[PDB]
Amino acid sequence: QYRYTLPVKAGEQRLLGELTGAACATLVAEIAERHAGPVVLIAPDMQNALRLHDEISQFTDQMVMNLADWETLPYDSFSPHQDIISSRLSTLYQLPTMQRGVLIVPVNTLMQRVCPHSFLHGHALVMKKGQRLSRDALRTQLDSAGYRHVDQVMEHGEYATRGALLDLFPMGSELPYRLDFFDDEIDSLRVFDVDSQRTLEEVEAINLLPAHEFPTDKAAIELFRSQWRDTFEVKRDPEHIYQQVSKGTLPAGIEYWQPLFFSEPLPPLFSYFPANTLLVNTGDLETSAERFQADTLARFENRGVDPMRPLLPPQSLWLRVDELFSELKNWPRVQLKTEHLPTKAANANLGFQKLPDLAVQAQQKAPLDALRKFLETFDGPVVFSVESEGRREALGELLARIKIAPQRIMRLDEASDRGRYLMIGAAEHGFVDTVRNLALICESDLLGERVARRRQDSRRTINPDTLIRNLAELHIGQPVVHLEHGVGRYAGMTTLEAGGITGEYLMLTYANDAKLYVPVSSLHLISRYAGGAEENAPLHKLGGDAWSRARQKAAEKVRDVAAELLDIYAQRAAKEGFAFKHDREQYQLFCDSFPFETTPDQAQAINAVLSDMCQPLAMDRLVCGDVGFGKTEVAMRAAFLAVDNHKQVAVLVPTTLLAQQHYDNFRDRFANWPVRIEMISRFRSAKEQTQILAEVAEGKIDILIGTHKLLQSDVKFKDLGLLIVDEEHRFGVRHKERIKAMRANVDILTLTATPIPRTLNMAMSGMRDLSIIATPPARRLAVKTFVREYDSMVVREAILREILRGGQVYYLYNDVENIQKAAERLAELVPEARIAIGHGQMRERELERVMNDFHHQRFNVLVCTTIIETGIDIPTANTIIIERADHFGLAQLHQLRGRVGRSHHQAYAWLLTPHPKAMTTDAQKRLEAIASLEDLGAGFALATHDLEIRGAGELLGEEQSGSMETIGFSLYMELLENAVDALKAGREPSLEDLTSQQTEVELRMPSLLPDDFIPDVNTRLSFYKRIASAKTENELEEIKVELIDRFGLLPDPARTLLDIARLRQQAQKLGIRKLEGNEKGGVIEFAEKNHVNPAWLIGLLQKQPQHYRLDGPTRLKFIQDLSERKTRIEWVRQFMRELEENAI
Amino acid sequence: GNRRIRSVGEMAENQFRVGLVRVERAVKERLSLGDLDTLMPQDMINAKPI
Ligand SMILES: Nc1ncnc2c1ncn2[C@@H]1O[C@H](COP(=O)(O)OP(=O)(O)OP(=O)(O)O)[C@@H](O)[C@H]1O
Ligand SMILES: [Mg+2]
């Protein structure tokens, strides 16, 4: 027995109470199971409907299905994307006889009118083999369809019923079909010829649906025109929809002139309902129907202008709320509402209390305190409802911390009196079902809230040294403090104009005589001086010296990159690769876990990657494929091959949010195989990194996803076997090579969508392989690009079109300082939306929360910078709005456009531009190019367009994109071959090895052999090797004299390099482990067994307190006026010598 | 009465105006970019396109 009775009568209601969040789901599951007939869930808004479509399906198994609505807005200008109609009609054809299941409609669709009968049981036929129907029923329905009984069916509108076999020549196609009803059932779908009557194919289910929502044939066009001349007025213009339809074409938003085509009023959709449904509500309807009617009326009057393209009244294409509640008194109804309903029949209360304070945080030494104390005091069962599959493991290793191991159940009524279970679904909030004592603890009840940004005391001081009461009496020349800019000199009253207002101002002279005028209405921002130096007061510069001091830096080309890159590649080309082992079935299971199908180009790229990894050479492959084509699953099916040989994949992504997304996706995909995946970035705190690094070094973590924090010289993999650069049109060069440098024979799998020109040319010349991806995966539609001048009405219409569909919006802004004001302005413009700010300059525990909540639909619009430029998935987001698209690269614009789409929904992307009197010519060229290439597979064409204009940079340097007089590939292969042969023969270690054991004497003062001095990169590299490997000062001097002979005078960088290597030679023998230097001083880092006199050390400290300070066990900070580099060098050498004479 | 003379002053002023258009475009972009409250005009205009 159950808790309450369902109603079965005309329109009697049942109010259910107290059902808190994600309990509407379990009630509708219970109702759908206990009811002998359909259940129609009338959600309050499409958003909720979509959410319910995922929640309900978790708690039962009846066919829960939506009703795919036109994703346009009322009286919009876009077509409903014909695929949608192919699923909007089919539902309607089954709806008069569905015998079980749940149909979810919002009131946006519920208030709409739909095709009114006839046309459906006239222009369609859906029939599967499990249609238990007779012959003469089809006979009379085709009779009503107007088909003629022809024994030799050859043309449209013909049917036959002879013996046991039934024939049709349908209105839609040109093929007749044989049916073969047996025993009140259909048994065959024999595609037989127009005349020969010979079966071509036997099928099980047939679909002949009209590809337009309204009839399109000539008679219906004439009817449309006649109704038009009845109601509207025809104007002579080749764009008026009267002449557009008459000429045969269908305009953009033609679906909103639906009722004209039919000459019988559109039925209110309720005629399509079965005999005995049971309308289950959610929230409220007599509040959301009214809101939608008001918005529809607003759109009708808004667009009830424009004599071109006129509109029907909303009564003609929508139910009026009065009619809608005339009809919801014609169905037996159950309302699920979250509040204590008092007492009566047709009313009931289901005790569904909210969960207690469940939250965790790393602040307490016991983080799992709320849960550990709740799960002992709970007599009932507890079901944990984790979100995905992989998240189970991310929740399975967290409840192991308090000795709770959850079984996995399938249906919620498998719970005991006492047990912990978890189930996988999409529920969003918990509940303590105190009726049957059970509890559901959704994963969003373990991550309660974030409460930081609680600040620090005092950002202002009031009435101290200078009250600043200021009834003006100040003299002229008297120093003054502005709170924001510092000390200036008050230079009198003045009068000014400011664009329409004449005001009085105070006159303040800062440094360089740059004057600041402050209003007299706001003189309280100004205080008197306090240092007691009214004659010795300083003077700041307004606006700082950021612009001035930024040119102080550079021009020394402190490091030569050609030698390093040549040595990296030369070490690469020498070592034999690893030839992975491939297990057929043990990778077949990994393939079977993929819930999709590999398109015949993705399965070609995957096969190439595997057959390249299983070769004795070293891969270097680019997987350039257009955005959203499933490039990442190539990385996973290569990562499985790698780590199945115990080989420590390392995935490298160029931003934090992409790192978090890839961490979640990899835990999802590797959710059963014993490979421990971890992510290292700036999200992970310093007590998590210091454990992840220890794990990696010991070799237990087997996939490590990281931002640039990965390549920071403290990350030592045990057995690295595969490197997956993701979104490599970033990273520069040194970041891409900094992981290849430590392990040469590693395999690199370089994933990108628009490769940056250097690594596109270098793929087009054979240095790397290339495996393009085309054939967009399943149901992707090319994103529609629109380029408009910025307009608040355009923004509002775009946002509402997306939101009332239920999706989400990226509103890309790309200016951090003004993004707060931009989000405020947006939230005042569109009150209907929910808006959050996302950019990579927050406290990062706020960015975690923001992009988590975005993934869980807790807000719609995300005002964001270009941190979302790198492959954030979010398959619901289907509208990007680029605020200022004029300054963005072609590759940048393509990646931003690729964020939307990602699923079967047609997704628009707007590139708002400033008004064209201030856009450069190159900007309109870029924008017209990116709007032209609005198709699929456009990524690689755009990349090879960006190359060829930008031109590939140095093949053996930094600076990926630019002409800039590279070295030739034909020269480069010869140079590399010479390096390979000298290296292998010689067997010298890599330059990086000479960097590894190098006692660091980073004194950040240039040290290299200049290019003109030794032009041959190979020979210069040989001197690098022989210098840094010189282990005697005599050997260094022999190098010096040989280099003097072979190339004359020694430039300053060269001789400094020699002296620095000398100091290395000395300090490694001494016990100095890392020595520094700078303009103002430096630090010397000793080893554990050093040759430093500690008595002399304390002597240094106590006779020079202004020069020597110990901060650390071996960190001896020295400070000296090292304003000349030569003085710096002599200082450090003399320091060491003074140490070595006292060495012990 | 239909052909007129533009000597040194008018021609050079035209080129100065051509430069000033690019200057004011750059000024507008630099203003609409962030962090207004610590800008100064010297760090705002470029003396290159004049
Ligand atoms: N063959 C396929 N058929 C259908 N869907 C696919 C197929 N391959 C991938 N997908 C889906 O398409 C989406 C593409 O995301 P994915 O990250 O895999 O590629 P991508 O987005 O191009 O890579 P990146 O994140 O670097 O841009 C994924 O959600 C994936 O589930
Ligand atoms: Mg990727």
- Which residue bears the tokens 């307190």? A1105
Total Cβ atoms within 10 A of residue A1078: 14
Indicate the pairing of strand A347-349 with strand A13-17: parallel
Residue in A757, A1125, A789 with CA at minimum distance from that of residue A940: A757
Q: How far apart are CA A550 and CA A573, in angstroms?
A: 41
For A319-347, give one letter per residue: b (16+ CB within 10 A) or e: bebeebeebbeebbbbbbbeeeeeeeeee
Range B29-33, long-range pairs (CB < 8 A, 24+ positions)? B29/A918, B33/A815
**Considering only CA atoms, which residue is closest to atom 25 of ligand 1?**
A871
A869 ligand 1 Cβ < 6 A: no
**Helical ranges in A987-1093 per DSSP H:** 991-996, 1017-1028, 1033-1047, 1052-1070
- Whole-angstrom CA distances from A8 to A35, A41, A278, A475 are 10, 16, 8, 90
Kindly state the helix (H) or strand (E) to which residue A52 belongs, with its residue range.
helix A46-59
- CA neighbours closer than 13 Å in the CB half-sphere of residue A837: 22
Radius of gyration of chain A (CA): 37
- Mutual orientation of helices A1052-1070 and A1125-1141 as an angle, nearest 10°? 20
Q: How far apart are CA A752 and CA A946, in angstroms?
A: 15
Q: How far apart are CA A996 and CA A269, in angstroms?
A: 75
Per DSSP, the three-state class of A48 is: helix
Mutate to test the interface with B, among A509, A547, A549 (most CBs of B within 10 A): A547
Q: Do A817 and B34 touch (CB under 8 A)?
A: yes
Q: What CATH number is attached to the domain comprising A667? A: 3.40.50.300
| Structure-determination technique | cryo-EM
Q: What CATH number is attached to the domain comprising A183? A: 3.30.2060.10
Residue in A330, A340, A220 with CA at minimum distance from that of residue A273: A330
Q: How far apart are CA A530 and CA A544, in angstroms?
A: 22
**Helical ranges in A765-844 per DSSP H:** 792-803, 816-829
> For residue A683, what are the domain limits?
561-770
Q: A930, A897 in Cβ contact below 8 A? A: yes
Closest Cβ opposite residue B25 in set A514, A547, A918: A918
Q: How long a stretch of residues is chain B? A: 50
Q: How many CB pairs under 8 A join A and B?
A: 22
Per DSSP, the three-state class of A177 is: strand
DSSP state, A841?
Answer: T
Sign of torsion over alpha carbons A937, A877, A849, A393: negative
The alpha carbon torsion through A246, A249, A255, A258 (nearest 10 deg) reads 20
- Mutual orientation of helices A969-986 and A561-574 as an angle, nearest 10°? 70
Residues 6+ positions from A4 with CB-CB distance below 8 Å: A14, A16, A348, A350
B47 lies within 8 A of chain A by CB: no
Residue A605 token pair: 């790229």
Bridge partners (DSSP) of residue A489 are A479, A509
Render A402-423 in DSSP notation, one character per residue.
TT---EE-SSGGG--SS-EEE-
Q: A279, A324 in Cβ contact below 8 A? A: no
In SS3 terms, A473-528 reads as CCCCCCEEEECCCEEEEEEEEEEEECCCCEEEEEEEECHHHCEEEEECCCHHHEEE
Per DSSP, the three-state class of A65 is: strand
- Mutual orientation of helices A631-643 and A602-613 as an angle, nearest 10°? 30
Q: How far apart are CA A371 and CA A382, in angstroms?
A: 11
DSSP state, A788?
Answer: E
- Mutual orientation of helices A1017-1028 and A561-574 as an angle, nearest 10°? 90
Residue in A1138, A1120, A1118 with CA at minimum distance from that of residue A1128: A1120
Radius of gyration of chain B (CA): 16
Q: What CATH number is attached to the domain comprising A1106? A: 3.90.1150.50
CA of A634 to the centre of ligand 1 (A): 9
List strands edge to edge, sheet with A502-509.
Answer: A515-519, A502-509, A486-497, A479-482, A526-528
Total Cβ atoms within 10 A of residue A819: 21
Residues 6+ positions from A1068 with CB-CB distance below 8 Å: A999
Q: Do B40 and A815 touch (CB under 8 A)?
A: no
Q: Which ligand ends up closest to the CA of A872?
A: 1
From the CA of B5, how many Å to the nearest CA of chain A?
31
Residue in A365, A437, A430 with CA at minimum distance from that of residue A401: A365
Q: Do A815 and B34 touch (CB under 8 A)?
A: yes
Q: How far apart are CA A913 and CA A930, in angstroms?
A: 13
A939 ligand 1 Cβ < 6 A: no
Indicate the pairing of strand A1115-1119 with strand A1108-1110: antiparallel
Chain B residues with CB-CB distance to A815 below 8 A: 33-34
Chain B residues with CB-CB distance to A920 below 8 A: 25
Query: Residue B50 CA to chain centroid, in angstroms?
Result: 6
Sign of torsion over alpha carbons A486, A488, A492, A494: negative
A595 Cα nearest atom in ligand 1: 31
Closest Cβ opposite residue A514 in set B37, B38, B40: B40
CA of A89 to the centre of ligand 1 (A): 29
Q: A160, A168 in Cβ contact below 8 A? A: yes
For A80-118, give one letter per residue: b (16+ CB within 10 A) or e: bbeebbeebbebbbebeebeebbbbbbbbbbbbbbbbbe
Bridge partners (DSSP) of residue A255 are none
The residue of chain B with its CA nearest to that of A822 is: B34
Residue A49 token pair: 């409907």
B39 lies within 8 A of chain A by CB: yes
- Which residue bears the tokens 């006026």? A1121
Q: A51, A295 in Cβ contact below 8 A? A: no
B33 lies within 8 A of chain A by CB: yes
Q: How far apart are CA A641 and CA A638, in angstroms?
A: 5
Q: A765, A969 in Cβ contact below 8 A? A: yes
Q: How far apart are CA A187 and CA A179, in angstroms?
A: 7
Residue A274 token pair: 């079965």
Residue in A487, A169, A145, A111 with CA at minimum distance from that of residue A324: A111
Q: A172, A157 in Cβ contact below 8 A? A: no
